[PDB]
Amino acid sequence: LKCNKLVPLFYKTCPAGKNLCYKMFMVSNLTVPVKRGCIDVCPKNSALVKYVCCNTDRCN
Amino acid sequence: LKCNKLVPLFYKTCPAGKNLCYKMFMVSNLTVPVKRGCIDVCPKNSALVKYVCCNTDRCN
Amino acid sequence: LKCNKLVPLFYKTCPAGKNLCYKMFMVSNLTVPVKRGCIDVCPKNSALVKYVCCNTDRCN
Amino acid sequence: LKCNKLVPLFYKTCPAGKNLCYKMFMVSNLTVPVKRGCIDVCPKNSALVKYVCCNTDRCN
Amino acid sequence: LKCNKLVPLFYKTCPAGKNLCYKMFMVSNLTVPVKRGCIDVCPKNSALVKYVCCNTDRCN
């Protein structure tokens, strides 16, 4: 699939067997992603690092 | 005045005369700007581009 | 709200229900609107035509 | 190779074709480039548009 | 006074003693200027070169 990069004007064709897009936020600000891309499985949230995943094309 | 860069987690301190921050969008995609910084006056919109401007610190 | 008309120097008070100003162009020639005015909601581009809107007095 | 893309704070790895990074400047300002990218061959300066190219990771 | 310049998205605060913005055209193409900026006195049109001058901000 196709997922946005950090500057979401740009996008990536996800490699084989990553069929999730994600956004990584830092807990300080849940409105400003510091990472975007493709992923296999949505990682769990940690104390300071939150993730949101999705599966449409460029959903992130 | 402080305004956000394109990667809006960073900022720059607007030089003198420039007391507005702006986002520039291609009208084909109003979700994500191609340009962020400071300006003196909010430029007028073209056929392909949209400018939004604001006066607060990091308002963009 | 006030929006400019086609001709430079002239403008009008938008009616009830129209809170954007806009500009319309033909793709043949993008420097010269063929509509300039008030409107309720920004049309989406269709064949041969480009629109752009704004929501400040005489922004168009 | 890796080049900055659009802004100094963002980057991509180049496709197969392209083995230079570029900065493009308007003559009005030879300090801040408007574009930055990967490219095959360094394009040619116009009177209005200057390019600088290089071949180290994020050299541009 | 502030006047538009030739390079796009560029402007100049007109120095002292220049209170006119202008545009210069070659007589063969009246749709693309070759000079745009600040001036003291509107030059007189010539055989090959034409001018128009104005004096509100960014009117050229």
Curated annotation (Swiss-Prot), chains A, B, C, D, E:
Compartmental location: Secreted; Target cell membrane
Molecular-function annotations in GO: toxin activity
GO cellular component: extracellular region; membrane; other organism cell membrane
Disulfide bridge positions per record: 3-21, 14-38, 42-53, 54-59
Tissue: Expressed by the venom gland.
Keyword set includes Membrane: yes
Gene Ontology BP term (one): killing of cells of another organism
UniProtKB keywords: Cardiotoxin, Cytolysis, Disulfide bond, Hemolysis, Membrane, Secreted, Signal, Target cell membrane, Target membrane, Toxin
Purpose: Basic protein that binds to cell membrane and depolarizes cardiomyocytes. It also shows lytic activities, but 2-fold less important than that of CTX-A4. It binds to the integrin alpha-V/beta-3 (ITGAV/ITGB3) with a moderate affinity. It may interact with sulfatides in the cell membrane which induces pore formation and cell internalization and is responsible for cytotoxicity in cardiomyocytes. It may also target the mitochondrial membrane and induce mitochondrial swelling and fragmentation.
Quaternary state and interactors: Monomer in solution; Homodimer and oligomer in the presence of negatively charged lipids forming a pore with a size ranging between 20 and 30 Angstroms.
UniProt record similarity statement: Belongs to the three-finger toxin family. Short-chain subfamily. Type IA cytotoxin sub-subfamily.
Protein name: Cytotoxin 2
